[PDB]
């Protein structure tokens, strides 16, 4: 078997090759369906959505016709909703009023469409909400109970503002803008760094969906909101500064407040009353580090929250009555009578609790039914805690008065607020997961008593949409077609769904499907294609898709991989191999989706003469908790076995794979594994290129690290064995084998990781290559040029093998 040698391009030639082959718009999303209710007209529904038509991500609408010509294919045209001469990330809407609300740059704007006002046939001028606030307003939201009222965040404080009356009032005085960050670490209504980065919770305030009428003929509006104290939280610097909770250090001090807003009959503010918890957060919610999720019951009787312990191994869904909140009062005497005024019946309610020896994966599935009985609550939730696969469970929990009495002056026991479980029915089950993250949610038809959900049942390589009864769960009907991964949205009216779908051969597509029922059984569901929203571009002419492969592993699981065969393959000749790797939690690289946009350059590599290989090792997602839990406390210790195992699977089954000439490359967790690879399996991997790698888990945040690696105090040996900075001595003593790439201003994986590795590589007298991108298209081009040139001169080419 002869070794193949890649063309040795000059730097100038490689640059040109890359510029020619290079020669990604946000596909429509945030769909909403509004009925036309016009019997004489041709359209059942208008859909609104966000999309890029190098453009503003903006609002569009399309017309859903009552009938189609089933001989032809209908392509909906995109009608601009706004009169435009930055972007719109998200929008808010109120059905009764037809009020849209959204941020675009510095301005909060609003418009009406689809309400009592009727339906525009032309773009609307966005109406700016006037403000006196110096700085940018963030995270605006319509009050669902009065669309004249919005809320927003200015300088880490909650404000409300009336789009009719022009009235603007600050609700919280927790922070002053002209201040030092060491001086002021307090914020209200804003989710802190760890909750954004590690739990994907972006908002920290929640309009109560219902009014309460005042006897005068006015009303009370309400805002549940998280208030955070970051005083005790590590501060770090980047070429400004922010509060980063390093693993094993302090997370922010947290609590629930409730802003109660009295409005008169003319819609002017009478008074604002900031309320606090009757007993400090730490008493009422023992053991709870993070507020993962919060909102309200549909009628606003209770607020709810999903609460986690620091070790993220215990989850509690808790009901919080507005009555548990008493005004913020200076005088002890006056304050003392308020606490007596609160009855002992008004206690917190833990409607659900679960635990695992692995970890809770937080998700966006939680549906509450209307309350049929004061003493009960009925809800759908998803959990891996029963079977080790995320499944939907319909639960009834009893709102028993607690044993604990505040009047007595004692402290509450652990299980004092636990609620009995009347009913806990599994709606789904199997060796596959319900998806509850990154847009994946459920839709509940309360009339037909059905629930639409996305899942891995047909294959862990493809997402499909499914329906099932939550009343007598059995048959799970798949609604999307096989041979594609789907990302779906269901109309609130549950008579339509939209799928964004693709596969390795074909670019993403967006289609609309009409849902029907046979007249004899409403619970049974069929789908018919209705219209295209976004036509697939079509197979890329210059792009050759990889083949998906699998192999039963010695670890007892199937492992899936992608193999990019060298273009123009020669017989008898063995080729140099590049392993591209992520291999960390919460991510799957290997699935039936178009990889031609993001991983187009794995194709470019194949074109130069490299075998390219990707493998989802254990710890990767869409394979259930047991498969994910394999590296718990042992990050870095197993992933490279699985990668090597798969590489030897392929090498015995194909002989164009030259095992003497394997390179590995990855960003973030991949950068980490690329370093671990050269360190542990020096005999397999000739070169390792580490992009922005984790090199020292003690330099990484609480929410992520402690979930997978525990508190460092109780896992020094795992933290040590998983930290490449601490094991510098194990790298090769010959150069041209280790390449480090890092953004200087990285705020997720600090440059700190790369510098601390560099000081330890120097102490250990080890060689290294480094590249830095100090601030942007120009950086990307330099990366790809440097990567291809490094692989050529140090792996692929003639001169590379001479160099040893």
Ligand X SMILES: *C(=O)C1(C(=O)Nc2cccc(CN3CCN(Cc4ccc(Br)cc4)CC3)c2)CCOCC1
Could you give the residue numbers annotated as active site? 668, 746
Contact present, 576 and 611 (Cβ < 8 Å):
yes
CA gyration radius, the chain:
29
580 makes contact, choosing from ligand X, a copy of itself, none, with CB < 5 to 8 Å by partner type, with ligand X
To the nearest whole angstrom, how small is the minimum distance from the Cβ of residue 564 to ligand X? 11
* 3-class DSSP state of 224: strand
Kindly tell me which of 167 and 793 has the beta carbon lying closer to a copy of itself: 793
Among residues 71 and 802, whose Cβ is nearest to a copy of itself? 802
| Single residue of 196, 249, 313, 779 touching a copy of itself by CB under 8 A | 779
SS3 99: strand
Minimum distance, C-beta of residue 598 to ligand X, in the bound complex (Å) = 5
CB of 196 to ligand X, least distance (A): 13
Q: Which residues lie below 8 Å from residue 641, measured CB to CB, with a gap of 6+?
A: 555, 617
| 560, interface contact from ligand X, a copy of itself, none, CB < 5-8 Å by kind | none
Which of a copy of itself, ligand X, none is residue 428 near (CB under 5 to 8 Å by kind)?
Answer: none
Which of residues 655 and 729 has its CB atom nearest to a copy of itself in the complex? 729
Minimum distance, C-beta of residue 640 to a copy of itself, in the bound complex (Å): 24
**What phi, psi does 374 have (nearest 5°)?**
-50, -25
Which DSSP letter does residue 125 get? Answer: P
| 23 is an interface residue for a copy of itself by CB under 8 A | no
- Which CB sits closer to a copy of itself, 20 or 374? 20
Q: How far is the CB of 559 from ligand X (least distance, A)?
A: 21
Q: In angstroms, what is the minimal distance from the CB of 777 to ligand X?
A: 11
**CB-based burial label for 19 (10 Å; 0-12, 13-18, 19+):** exposed
Closest-CB residue for ligand X?
668
Residue 755 binds which entry of ligand X, a copy of itself, none, with Cβ cut-offs from 5 to 8 Å by kind? a copy of itself
Q: Report the alpha-carbon distance of residue 67 to residue 515 in Å, rounded.
A: 13
Does the protein bind a copy of itself through residue 11 (CB under 8 A)? yes
Determine the 3-state secondary structure of 773 from DSSP.
strand
Residue 788 interacting entry, from ligand X, a copy of itself, none, C-beta within 5 to 8 Å by type: ligand X
Q: Which residues of 313-349 are buried (b: 16+ CB within 10 A; e: fewer)?
A: bbbbbbbbbbebbbeeeeeeeeeeeeeeebeeeebbb
DSSP alpha helix (H) spans, 513-668: 600-608, 625-629, 639-653
Q: Angle at the Cα of 725 (from 719 to 731), degrees rounded to 5?
A: 120
What number of chain residues touch a copy of itself (CB under 8 A)? 37
Q: How many C-beta neighbours within 10 Å does residue 399 have? A: 17
> Distances in Å between the alpha carbon of 189 and those of 77, 158, 206, 268, 297?
39, 6, 8, 23, 19
Q: Which of 10, 121, 132, 415 binds a copy of itself (CB under 8 A)?
A: 10
Question: Is 116 a binder of a copy of itself (CB under 8 A)?
Answer: no
CB atoms within 10 A of CB 76: 20
Question: Among residues 781, 789, 786, 731, which one has the least CA distance to residue 757?
Answer: 731
Shortest separation between residue 666's beta carbon and ligand X, angstroms: 8
Using rule CB under 8 A, residue 181 touches a copy of itself: no
User: Which 3 state secondary structure label does DSSP give 460?
Assistant: coil
Question: Please, what is the minimum distance in Å from the beta carbon of residue 346 to a copy of itself?
Answer: 47
Contacted by 586, from ligand X, a copy of itself, none: CB < 5 to 8 Å by type: none
Burial 477-504 (b: 16+ CB within 10 A, else e): bebbeeebbbbbbbbeebbbbbbbbbbb
Q: Of residues 789, 794, 795, 796, which one binds a copy of itself by CB under 8 A?
A: 789
775 binds a copy of itself per the rule CB under 8 A: yes
Query: Smaller CB distance to a copy of itself: residue 637 or 736?
Result: 736
| 68: partner contacted, choices a copy of itself, ligand X, none (Cβ within 5-8 A by kind) | none
The 3 state secondary structure assigned to 179-202 is CCCCCCCEEECECCHHHHHHHCCC
Q: Are 700 and 246 in contact (CB under 8 A)?
A: yes
Report the C-alpha gap between 691 and 520 in whole angstroms: 59
Whether residue 602 contacts residue 569, with contact meaning beta carbons closer than 8 Å, is answered with: no
Binding partner of residue 771 among ligand X, a copy of itself, none, CB under 5 to 8 Å per kind?
a copy of itself
Q: Among residue numbers 235 through 294, which ones bind a copy of itself (CB under 8 A)?
A: 237, 239
Choices 11-19, 118-126, 204-212, 271-279 (CB under 8 A): range interacting with a copy of itself = 11-19
**With binding defined as CB under 8 A, does residue 179 bind a copy of itself?**
no
**Nearest CB to ligand X, comparing residues 114 and 663:** 663
For residue 691, the minimal CB distance to ligand X (Å) is 6
CA-based nearest residue to 149, from 263, 274, 300: 263
Q: Which of residues 708-767 bind a copy of itself (CB under 8 A)?
A: 733-735, 744, 755-756, 758-759, 762-763, 765, 767
Stretch that binds a copy of itself, among 5-13, 73-81, 430-438, 523-531 (CB under 8 A): 5-13
- Give the single-character DSSP code of 353: E
Minimum Å gap between C-beta 764 and a copy of itself is 9
Least separation in angstroms between residue 694's CB and ligand X is 9
635 token code pair? 């990050």
Residue 781 interacting entry, from a copy of itself, ligand X, none, C-beta within 5 to 8 Å by type:
a copy of itself
Are 259 and 222 in contact, with CB atoms under 8 Å apart? yes
Given ligand X, a copy of itself, none, residue 599, with its beta carbon under 5 to 8 Å by kind, binds ligand X
Residues that bind ligand X in the complex, under the rule CB under 6 A: 580, 598-599, 601-602, 667-668, 691-692, 746, 748-749, 784, 787-788
553/779 with CB nearer a copy of itself:
779
For 92-174, where are the E strands, in sequence order?
92-94, 99-104, 107-112, 127-128, 138-143, 146-154, 157-162, 168-170
Q: What is the distance between the alpha carbons of residues 455 and 463, in angstroms, rounded to a whole number?
A: 6
Closest CB to a copy of itself among residues 338, 745: 745
CB 399 within 8 A of CB 350: no
Is 771 a binder of a copy of itself (CB under 8 A)?
yes
The two three-digit tokens of residue 651, written as one number? 């090498």
Q: Does residue number 20 form part of the binding site for a copy of itself (CB under 8 A)?
A: no
- The residue among 500 and 737 lying less far from a copy of itself, judged by its C-beta, is 737
The DSSP bridge partners found for residue 45 are 35, 64
645: contact with a copy of itself by CB under 8 A: no
Of 560 and 667, which has the nearer Cβ to a copy of itself?
667
The answer to whether 159 touches 153, Cβ cutoff 8 Å, is yes
306 token code pair: 């999903």
Residue number, 148 or 746, with CB nearest to a copy of itself: 746
Q: What angle do CA 392, 707, 634 make, to 5 degrees?
A: 115
Identify what 598 binds: ligand X, a copy of itself, none; CB under 5 to 8 Å per kind: ligand X
Question: Which of residues 1, 178, 332, 802 is near a copy of itself by CB under 8 A?
Answer: 802
Cα separation values, 12 from 388, 686, 769, 785, Å: 53, 26, 21, 9
Helix axes 600-608, 11-22, angle to 10 degrees: 130
CB of 74 to a copy of itself, least distance (A): 46
SS3 label, residue 705? helix
Partner from a copy of itself, ligand X, none binding residue 786, C-beta < 5-8 Å depending on class: a copy of itself
Look at residue 602 and give the partner it binds from ligand X, a copy of itself, none, a contact being a CB closer than 5 to 8 Å depending on partner kind: ligand X
The residues binding a copy of itself (CB under 8 A) are 10-12, 15, 180, 237, 239, 733-735, 744, 755-756, 758-759, 762-763, 765, 767, 769-775, 778-779, 781-782, 785-786, 789, 793, 799, 802-803
């Amino acid at each position: 078997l002869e070794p193949f040698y890649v063309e040795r391009y000059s730097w100038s030639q490689l640059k040109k090759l890359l510029a020619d082959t290079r020669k990604m718009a946000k596909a429509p999303h945030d769909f909403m369906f509004v009925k036309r209710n016009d019997p004489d007209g041709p359209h059942s529904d208008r859909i609104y959505y966000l999309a890029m038509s190098n453009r503003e991500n903006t609002l569009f609408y399309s017309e859903i016709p009552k009938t189609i010509n089933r001989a032809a294919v209908l392509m909906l045209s995109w009608k601009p909703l706004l009169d435009l001469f930055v972007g719109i990330a998200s929008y808010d809407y109120h059905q009764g009023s037809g009020t849209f609300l959204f941020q675009a740059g510095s301005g909060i704007y609003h418009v009406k469409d689809g309400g009592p006002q009727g339906f525009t046939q032309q773009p609307l001028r966005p109406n700016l909400v006037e403000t006196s606030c110096p700085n940018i307003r963030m995270d605006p939201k319509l009050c669902p109970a009065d669309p004249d009222w919005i809320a927003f965040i200015h300088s880490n404080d909650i404000w409300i503002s009336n789009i009719v009356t022009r009235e603007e009032r600050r609700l919280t005085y927790v922070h002053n803008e002209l201040a030092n960050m060491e001086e002021d670490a307090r914020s209200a209504g804003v989710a802190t760094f760890v909750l954004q980065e590690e739990f994907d919770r972006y908002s920290g305030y929640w309009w109560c969906p219902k009014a309460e009428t005042t006897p005068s003929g006015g009303k009370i509006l309400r805002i549940l909101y998280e208030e955070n104290d970051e005083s005790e939280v590590e501060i770090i610097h980047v070429t400004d500064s922010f509060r980063y909770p390093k693993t094993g250090t302090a997370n922010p001090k947290v609590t629930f407040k409730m802003s109660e807003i009295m409005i008169d009959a003319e819609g002017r503010i009478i008074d604002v009353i900031d309320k606090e918890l009757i007993q400090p957060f730490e008493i009422l919610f023992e053991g709870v580090e993070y507020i993962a999720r919060a909102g309200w019951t549909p009628e606003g009787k209770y607020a709810w929250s999903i609460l986690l312990d620091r070790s993220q191994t215990r989850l509690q869904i808790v009901l919080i009555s507005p009555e548990l909140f008493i005004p913020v009062e200076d005088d002890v005497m006056e304050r003392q009578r308020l606490i007596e005024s609160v009855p002992d019946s008004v206690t917190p309610l833990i409607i659900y609790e679960e635990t695992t020896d692995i970890w809770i994966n937080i998700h966006d599935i939680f549906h509450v039914f209307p309350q049929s009985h004061e003493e009960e609550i009925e809800f759908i939730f998803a959990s891996e805690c029963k079977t080790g696969f995320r499944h939907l469970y319909k639960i009834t929990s009893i709102l028993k008065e607690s044993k604990y009495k505040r009047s007595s002056g004692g402290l509450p026991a652990p299980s004092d607020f636990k609620c009995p479980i009347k009913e806990e029915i599994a709606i789904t089950s199997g060796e596959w997961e319900v998806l509850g993250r990154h847009g994946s949610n459920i839709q509940v038809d309360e009339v037909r008593r059905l629930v639409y959900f996305e899942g891995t049942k047909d294959s862990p390589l493809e997402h499909h949409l499914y329906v099932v009864s939550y009343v007598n769960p059995g048959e799970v009907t798949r609604l999307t077609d096989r041979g594609y991964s789907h990302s779906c949205c269901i109309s609130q009216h549950c008579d339509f769904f939209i799928s964004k779908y693709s596969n390795q051969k074909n670019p993403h597509c967006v289609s609309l499907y009409k849902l029907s029922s046979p007249e004899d059984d409403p619970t049974c569901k069929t789908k018919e294609f209705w219209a295209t929203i976004l036509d697939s571009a079509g197979p890329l002419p210059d792009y050759t898709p990889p083949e998906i492969f699998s192999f039963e592993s010695t670890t007892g699981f199937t492992l899936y991989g992608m193999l990019y065969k060298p273009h123009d393959l020669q017989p008898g000749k063995k080729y140099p191999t590049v392993l591209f790797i992520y291999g960390g939690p919460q991510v799957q690289l290997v699935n039936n989706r178009f990889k031609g946009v993001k991983y187009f350059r794995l194709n470019t590599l194949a074109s130069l003469g490299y075998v390219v290989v990707v493998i989802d090792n254990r710890g990767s997602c869409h394979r259930g908790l047991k498969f994910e839990g394999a590296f718990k406390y042992k990050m870095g210790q197993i992933e490279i076995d699985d990668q090597v195992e798969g590489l030897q699977y392929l090498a015995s089954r194909y002989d164009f794979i030259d095992l003497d000439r394997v390179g590995i490359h990855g960003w973030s967790y991949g950068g980490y594994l690329s370093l671990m690879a050269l360190m542990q399996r020096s005999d397999i991997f000739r070169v390792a290129i580490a992009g922005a790698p984790v090199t020292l888990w003690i330099f990484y945040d609480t929410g992520y690290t402690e979930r997978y690696m525990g508190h460092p105090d109780q896992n020094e040996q795992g933290y040590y064995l998983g930290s490449v900075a601490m094991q510098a001595e194990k790298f090769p003593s010959e150069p041209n084998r280790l390449l480090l790439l890092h953004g200087f201003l990285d705020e997720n994986v600090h440059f700190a990781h790369t510098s601390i590795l560099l000081s330890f590589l120097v102490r250990a007298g080890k060689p290294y290559d480094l590249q830095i991108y100090p601030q942007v298209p120009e950086s990307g081009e330099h990366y790809e040029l440097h990567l291809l040139h490094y692989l050529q001169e140090n792996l692929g080419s003639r001169i590379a093998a001479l160099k040893v």
